[PDB]
């Protein structure tokens, strides 16, 4: 996929979300993160009246 195409040789900048990782930071090189992502939760509408 995208990472594979980068490491192929014919791409230079993966401007996209990339969800940095411990081990994913060896065969490529990163920069200063510019947003924060985390696994969140949603629930169905639970806002009635009295």
């Amino acid at each position: 996929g995208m990472m594979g195409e980068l490491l192929s040789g014919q791409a230079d900048m993966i401007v996209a979300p990339l969800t940095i990782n411990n081990e994913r930071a060896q065969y490529i090189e990163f920069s200063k993160p510019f947003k924060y992502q985390g696994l969140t939760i949603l629930v169905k509408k639970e806002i009635p009246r009295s």
Partner: protein, 52 residues
């Protein structure tokens, strides 16, 4: 302005007078609320302008 963070909290702590709101890193302004049994303070809103 306030000359110091502990001075800032104490200056807010003259309840209810003087200040009503504050702005600072969200890694001191969480310790500063994590020692009060009465928990008179709290953190609200959306974080912004990241910093390391």
């Amino acid at each position: 302005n306030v000359p110091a963070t502990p001075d800032g909290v104490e200056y807010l702590k003259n309840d209810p007078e003087k200040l009503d709101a504050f702005i600072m890193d969200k890694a001191l302004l969480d310790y500063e609320v994590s020692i009060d049994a009465d928990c008179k303070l709290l953190t609200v809103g959306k974080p912004f302008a990241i910093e390391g």
